[PDB]
Amino acid sequence: MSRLEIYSPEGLRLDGRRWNELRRFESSINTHPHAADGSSYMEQGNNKIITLVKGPKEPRLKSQMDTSKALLNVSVNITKFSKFERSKSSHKNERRVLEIQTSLVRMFEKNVMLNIYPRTVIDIEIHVLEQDGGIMGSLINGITLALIDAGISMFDYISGISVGLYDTTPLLDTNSLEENAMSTVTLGVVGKSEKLSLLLVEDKIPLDRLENVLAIGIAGAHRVRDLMDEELRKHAQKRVSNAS
Amino acid sequence: SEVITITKRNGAFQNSSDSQIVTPGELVTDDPIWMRGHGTYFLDNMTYSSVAGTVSRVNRLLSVIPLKGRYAPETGDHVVGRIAEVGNKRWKVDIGGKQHAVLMLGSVNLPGGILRRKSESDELQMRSFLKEGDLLNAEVQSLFQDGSASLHTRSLKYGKLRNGMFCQVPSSLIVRAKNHTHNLPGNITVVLGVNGYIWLRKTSQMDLARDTSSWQIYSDENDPSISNNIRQAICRYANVIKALAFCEIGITQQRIVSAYEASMVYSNVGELIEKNVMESIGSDILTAEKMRG
Amino acid sequence: RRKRLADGLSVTQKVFVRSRNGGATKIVREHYLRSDIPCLSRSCTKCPQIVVPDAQNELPKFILSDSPLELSAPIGKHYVVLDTNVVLQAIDLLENPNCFFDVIVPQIVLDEVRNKSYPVYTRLRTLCRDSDDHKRFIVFHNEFSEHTFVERLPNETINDRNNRAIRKTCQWYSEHLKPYDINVVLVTNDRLNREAATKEVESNIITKSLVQYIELLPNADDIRDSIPQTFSDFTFPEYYSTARVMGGLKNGVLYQGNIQISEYNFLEGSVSLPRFSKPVLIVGQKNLNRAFNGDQVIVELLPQSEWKAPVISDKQRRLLAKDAMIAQRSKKIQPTAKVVYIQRRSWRQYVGQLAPSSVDPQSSSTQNVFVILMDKCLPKVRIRTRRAAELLDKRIVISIDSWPTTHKYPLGHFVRDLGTIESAQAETEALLLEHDVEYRPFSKKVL
Amino acid sequence: GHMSLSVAEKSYLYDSLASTPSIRPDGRLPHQFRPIEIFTDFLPSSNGSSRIIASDGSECIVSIKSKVVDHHVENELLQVDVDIAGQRDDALVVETITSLLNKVLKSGSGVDSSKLQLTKKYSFKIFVDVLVISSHSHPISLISFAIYSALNSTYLPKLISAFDDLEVEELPTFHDYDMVKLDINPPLVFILAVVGNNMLLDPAANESEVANNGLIISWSNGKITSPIRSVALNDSNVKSFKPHLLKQGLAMVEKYAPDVVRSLENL
Amino acid sequence: QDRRRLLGPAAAKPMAFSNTESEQELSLHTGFIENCNGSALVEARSLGHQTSLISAVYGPRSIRGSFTSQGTISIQLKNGLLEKYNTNELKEVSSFLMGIFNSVVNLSRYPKSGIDIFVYLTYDKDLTNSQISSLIPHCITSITLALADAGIELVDMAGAGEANGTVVSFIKNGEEIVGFWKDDGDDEDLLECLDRCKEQYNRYRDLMISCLMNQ
Amino acid sequence: LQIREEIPSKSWDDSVPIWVDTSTELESMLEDLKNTKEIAVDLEHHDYRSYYGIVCLMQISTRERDYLVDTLKLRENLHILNEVFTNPSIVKVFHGAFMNIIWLQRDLGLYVVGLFDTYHASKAIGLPRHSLAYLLENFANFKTSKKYQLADWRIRPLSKPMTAYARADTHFLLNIYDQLRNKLIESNKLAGVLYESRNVAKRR
RNA sequence: AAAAUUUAAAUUUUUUUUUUUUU
């Protein structure tokens, strides 16, 4: 029994949001010029991520080398101050995390034009600072910045969002309070399409909603890569207008 | 009269000519007549960019030049290499670009010249002439199938550095010209690499020879006679590089001279590090750019 | 501070510290205001312009009529906006079918109830959805409302901004209800909140108390006995503080369970504790400490000086608590306990009968009466009331209001007017509810 | 280390800095530091936050989370925990710097744990939690600086009830909005280096490379204090040292220390 | 738990108990480990405090990494039986160890060659009714004797002396200092902190050279 | 060099900036400023409609009365203001007094000796925000005008809240020089404040 | 009317056990 109010009959959420609404969504480009040529910062609500990309460059060992394409390393940093309650132990080989480290690779095996970057290394650095739930799709949207943040060869935008289900009703952009309150699904959505990169369900879901549930998140996901685009573009105008 | 810049800003993560600017995933056109080059991929009509950059339409060739990326190596360029590794008869050496350049064993100026011919005992002395991290003048020959290219030293003018100091910049602000070695009043010399690597040293006689012994081409020696008036004059040219680099300024040899004489306000050379004052001198030259040419 | 979104939409941070298990756990949330907040009424024509469907694709129903009970000018037509306290005092007055048909529930008022009582919070959740043609309850989410949202002022407690926002909540209302001359009546019980509007501080606002509202009804005689509310031989003790009992629970000091107060002995009862085998008696009227039978309480053992044969530190009591289990194995002298806090009242609505001694025949005015309850184990309740000559040969519903320090018998108020003593219909009725039988017809949300 | 430099420089760099009119590669005065940027108060889930920017783009953030604890069952009332990006837990420079600042912030050495004291039975466990994005330096004296601002950017919720839990043993109560700033006098740390007969302040990485040896000096309370360690930067150029040079640097720190402090004691 | 070792059943616990200028002294011995090429044995006993520890040499071992011009030192501090110093407490000392020997060892004599140093904080009494800081100088002495036993090119018998929570390491019969370590103490006691350290250093190095030249 | 207590400026409705409309009231200031051993100073400049530069406005204030200097034709006639402004007995209190002097030095070459800096001198003792939006907030109880300061003062007469804002900014830096004339002697950083004032008025 | 003219793409191994985040 929860002593609180999940979703109002008057249509409202905890901050008063509707079921089809987002948090405040902020990106940034070239946050760290002195660090790497890929440096981008995310605020999606209180989900705050520093995203860092190194490459395309020489390996540390000739063993870790291919004569066909690039490699992709995922290093996730969950701080012990990432949550309200401070976690005791470190996470650096936690089997929960390694799954995502697998996950973003196979999500991003297929945007990178791998053949045109052979014998070189791409390393993607993650710094999870403030954690607000919706944690999975929070990452991917930070990734899509960071590859463009160096301008690496690719096909498309890739969008990510967790959308939750309170009993019948979809919830775009849940939080961790709502995440522990109901069943949620995250979608790794590619560009403008209807094709998926990531699809992950932990919670128990009745089958019959799911087609409708999947039909929800696309309009959210399309508005994601929407808001990424111009925000890059108004940055992109700021270069040449003052470069030239 | 200070030690450190401590200025405070609390409560925030952060403080917060027309051409086509295109994104990845974006259609350019589907006129089939266009040709498809760099930054471009496609499906039979659909012209699709892949980076954050600009549409370049060359006369039937459409291609996308990005804005962000590493240094692109091209042949015949005058850059600076830092010695990464030694191979079989090969060397590895950083450009700053995507990968290392390679450098053949006989690709270098031998002491005594060509009268010193080949020897298999030379690979027993690879570490003799060269070792790690060292800096030099190199001449970009040609490439491989990927885009990785190689170097050589076909002159006396190319060779291992000494007599000064290194600095480095983004590769963008370095402008192209028909010349790259430059000699500056103060009896000193900039060796602007294209790739973003910058070596200063004292003007040699060979430098003086450009405008009117040979066994010292792998030495770690300098001229022993180095005044502080040399040395402190190095640092004044040193910071004004980073001034223009912080101010995003295309390097003109004269602008440096213009940077140097504008820096004659300040004799305290340590004051050449200020975010404002570099920007102020940066603001000086751009205003001074609005007079001459 | 606050920030803006491009939809004209506001975003700010509400942040607090969770005090659970004594921890100091800082909790931060973002907060949104919207500008599509409906006024939810019949007469307004612009809040129905902004109403948008839900995920089930519905635009909801705007039910508060143009026609309230109209009263004596300068009331005229009016709506009612409440206090939590007047709800906390008079929750059953709200459930009168005879009156109060059109009430806005403010969101903060909704929350303090959800802060205070869970099944009372059910009833407002019950009434608002089960509002009908007659009686109409809405919930206005005023702190989701942009135009009624306020902040924490400097040097402020949380109580101040509560009263101020409710005052702010009413302030928008008549402004939106100027075009139809239906007023808004703010009801309170707080004398300091009945002080700042005496000067009419900012708003020319309808600040009346309960009785100051009750004294303006056309039919207020029937309902004023549903208004909630020396008498001394000694003084009863009190119940321990919050940090005292939470400080008592972990150490093994304090115990909770259920108590049974005997009918054949009104002043003696035992509990069944989880640590303890035998039913541990609590002896003494002060030691029962003005709780009722069946309630959830918090008890403390008594010293062996008060143990019965058929200190400052809790370092002593625990070692004495071990001696209780020894004395539990004795069954020759067994320990006594007393209550020190009440985990929960098992109060509800109650039905009884009055005392003929308590009533004056010649009087017509207000007077004290005690109610003889149908529960044999529970004592009489002093009822300050007018119409006792009516209700003496009649069945009644009360509800217990409070227990202050002095009163040997509690303050409560009559709620529902039932019918004649040993009439078959009325004796049918209380036979249902005092046996907990639902009888009410199926409501509008049922059908 | 980080960098690999060339030998011909290494002479000239060891030449120019060991000048008797000593010359930095950027040519500052020998006691100067380098320009930085200092941000805090930006992780609003935390008791305090911090964000500091170097001139070479070295980068760190230190977080402040607190916790209420019994101050009798636990000795260390204040804990430091450090993360460097790019490195294993097992590495050396990690653990030494980690173990260092614990000593620097011992509970009654320069730390005024009475200000941390909640009750006669309880107090505040604090967590100095450190994430370094990048460094090109022996990073330590940078890291103290943000922490100094981090403690100067930390608010704590207010006690409501009383504080004597020996007899009555009350469970302590906090207000839900009222925070008070931690009054504290945090220490500071300075990296030193010895070249020939010269002693530079704030060694940059080039300056850090060529040095014969270097120091770490603990500043607290407006004076010099412990922990103090002689410290290697490289290990190809490690030379010994006259002690008066060691005696020289102390006031050389000290007569320029509070001006850096007052620049940061500036609000 | 740890699947690699025998740690007993988990719910057990170890046993618990409750309450119901001076001289330092040595006994220094070499040549007693046949795995190594340099061994040294140290007894210490001082006033409430008796301490024994072992320094072990492996060198020159090959380096599978790459080319270096010269040698490279590796130092391990490991708990012995009773006293358990903290993990991060250990390696800080290991950091402080390496700095001094990098003003000692002719690494230039030893290209592409490794140095392995194993120090076993084997057993310590502290019967006294910065606890690691009291054991610093004896390490350097214990290392130096083992490094003489492997016969490696060492410039000086360098040693450290202690004065009350302060460790200062010398060369040239004290005429230069090579390693400095300070905890809390007084203020500006440095000049006396020169002295008592120096004379123990003046004591110890003579004890060391007796241990070898008389053998 | 002798500190006093905090003496704020006069009452805000007790004064409007009585501007110098010709050489007459321009001479009214040089007779009034030649008697005070302290003076508040401010200026405004537009870098748009001139190459040599036209200082759009100037504010010069005593302990009670503040001026608004009309410097269109008196740009060439601002040479008489140094009759009190080049004096060692009278500090000229301004916040960042470079372009208040240098634009009067670009066209008029004016004698600069002995001005009291309020902008960067606030940073050394530790008044954190050097802007006139803070000193009018913390020491003068006023509001700033930021979009109007980007706007010029080339024509005359000027706008009255715009002449109330920079004069509040003149009351700002003077009250950022009121307690700065007090607290400088305490924290042992006042000796650098005179040499920094010496570094601004000397080299050109 | 003969005569003839051009290229060149990189090889053989260094690491520390899995809890544990608010019905």
Query: What CATH number did the domain enclosing D96 receive?
Result: 3.30.230.70
Please check whether residues B271 and B258 belong to one and the same domain: yes
Please check whether residues B156 and B180 belong to one and the same domain: yes
> Could you tell me which residues are beta bridge partners of residue C209?
C188
Q: By the 8 A CB rule, do D109 and E184 touch? A: yes
D-chain residues within 8 Å CB-CB of C250? Answer: 171
In whole angstroms, what is the distance from residue E56 CA to residue E41 CA? Answer: 9
Please check whether residues B169 and B126 belong to one and the same domain: yes
Please check whether residues B38 and B173 belong to one and the same domain: no
How many other CB atoms sit within 10 Å of the CB of residue C338? Answer: 18
SS3 of residue C333 by DSSP: coil
Is residue B1 in a domain?
A: no
- CB < 7 A from strand G, the residues are A 1-2, 61-63, 67, 85, 87-88, 93-95, 180; B 87-88, 90, 102, 142-146, 148; E 2-4, 64
Q: Number of folded domains in chain D?
A: 1
- Can you point out the beta strands (E) in C125-244? 136-140, 182-188, 206-209
Q: How far is F180 from chain D (nearest CA, A)?
A: 15
In whole angstroms, what is the distance from residue C123 CA to residue C399 CA? Answer: 15
- B48: containing domain: 19-71
Find where tokens 């009383």 sit.
D162
What is the per-residue DSSP string for C73-101?
TTTBEEEEE--HHHHHH-TTTTT-TTS--
- For residue C23, report the phi and psi dihedrals to the nearest 5 degrees: -75, 165
Find where tokens 């059953």 sit.
C92
| Method in brief | cryo-EM
| Interchain pair E183, D229: CB under 8 A | no
- E1: containing domain: 1-215
Header resolution in angstroms = 4.6
- E87-101 and D92-104 helices cross at what angle (nearest 10)? 110
G strand bases under 7 Å from protein CB: 9-14, 17-23
Going by the DSSP 8-state scheme, the letter that residue B251 receives in this structure is: B
Asked whether the CA dihedral B68, B73, B75, B78 is positive or negative, the reply is: positive
Both structure tokens of D165: 């839990």
User: How far, in whole angstroms, is CA C303 from its chain's centroid?
Assistant: 36
- Rounding to the nearest 10 degrees, give the CA dihedral for residues A206, A212, A213, A219: 180
Give the distance, in angstroms, between residue F98 CA and nucleotide G3 C1': 83
Burial grade of A216 (CB within 10 A; 0-12, 13-18, 19 or more)? buried
Question: How many contacts (CB atoms, under 8 Å) link B and D?
Answer: 126
Return the partners of chain E (3 or more C-beta pairs < 8 Å): D
* H, E, C per residue of chain E: CCCCCCCCCCCCCCCCCCCCCCCCCEEEEECCCCCCCEEEEEEEEECCEEEEEEEEEEEEEECCCCCCCCCEEEEEEEECCCCCCCHHHHHHHHHHHHHHHCCCECHHHCCCEEEEEEEEEEEEEECCCCCCHHHHHHHHHHHHHHHHHCCCCECCCCEEEECCCEEEEEEHHHCEEEEEEECCCCCCCHHHHHHHHHHHHHHHHHHHHHHHHCC
Please check whether residues B89 and B233 belong to one and the same domain: yes
Do F and E touch, 3+ Cβ pairs within 8 Å? The answer is no
Please check whether residues B48 and B95 belong to one and the same domain: no
Q: Is the peptide bond before D258 cis (omega within 30 degrees of 0)?
A: no
Residues 6+ apart with CB under 8 A from C386: C221, C224, C225, C364, C365, C366, C367
Looking only at the bridges linking them, the beta strands covering E113-126 and E72-79 are: parallel
Contact status of C274 with chain D (Cβ, < 8 Å): no
Q: By the 8 A CB rule, do D25 and D43 touch? A: no
In whole angstroms, what is the distance from residue B139 CA to residue B153 CA? Answer: 6
Q: By the 8 A CB rule, do A59 and A65 touch? A: yes
SS3 of residue C103 by DSSP: strand
Q: How far is B48 from chain A (nearest CA, A)?
A: 8
Is residue B12 in a domain?
A: no
Instruction: Give the N- to C-terminal CA distance of chain A in Å, as an integer.
Output: 62
Say how many residues make up chain B: 293
Q: By the 8 A CB rule, do C137 and C128 touch? A: yes
- The CATH class that applies to domain A1-242 reads alpha beta
Please check whether residues B37 and B81 belong to one and the same domain: no
SS3 of residue D9 by DSSP: helix
Rg of chain E, C-alpha, whole Å: 19
> Could you tell me which residues are beta bridge partners of residue F88?
none
What are the distances in angstroms from CA C251 to CA A143, C248, E109, F132?
Answer: 51, 6, 69, 60
In whole angstroms, what is the distance from residue A13 CA to residue B209 CA? Answer: 79
- Rounding to the nearest 10 degrees, give the CA dihedral for residues D25, D30, D33, D34: -20
Out of 3.20.20.30, 2.40.50.700, 2.60.40.10, 3.40.50.1820, select the CATH number for domain C348-419. Answer: 2.40.50.700
Which nucleotide is at minimal CA–C1' distance from A176? Answer: G22
Return the partners of chain B (3 or more C-beta pairs < 8 Å): A, D, F
- D199: containing domain: 1-267
Mutate to test the interface with A, among B17, B47, B144 (most CBs of A within 10 A): B17
Please check whether residues B108 and B253 belong to one and the same domain: yes
Q: Residue D25: which of A1, B273, C69, C221 has the closest Cα?
A: B273
Going by the DSSP 8-state scheme, the letter that residue C292 receives in this structure is: -
| Interchain pair C17, D47: CB under 8 A | no
In whole angstroms, what is the distance from residue C40 CA to residue C106 CA? Answer: 13
How many other CB atoms sit within 10 Å of the CB of residue C123? Answer: 17
Residue C283 CA neighbour count, 13 Å, CB half: 11
What are the distances in angstroms from CA C400 to CA C40, C87, C234, C409, E166?
Answer: 35, 14, 22, 10, 75
Residue B111 CA neighbour count, 13 Å, CB half: 12
Q: Number of folded domains in chain B?
A: 2
The CATH number that applies at residue E188 is 3.30.230.70
C-chain residues within 8 Å CB-CB of D168? Answer: 244, 247, 312
Q: By the 8 A CB rule, do C107 and C141 touch? A: yes
Q: Which helix (H) or strand (E) holds B183?
A: strand B181-184
Contact status of F126 with chain B (Cβ, < 8 Å): no
Residues 6+ apart with CB under 8 A from E29: E40, E41, E211
| Interchain pair D262, F128: CB under 8 A | no
In whole angstroms, what is the distance from residue B172 CA to residue B195 CA? Answer: 8
Q: By the 8 A CB rule, do C188 and C85 touch? A: yes
Answer left, alpha or beta for residue E72, where phi above 0 means left and psi between -120 and 50 means alpha: beta
Contact status of F128 with chain B (Cβ, < 8 Å): yes
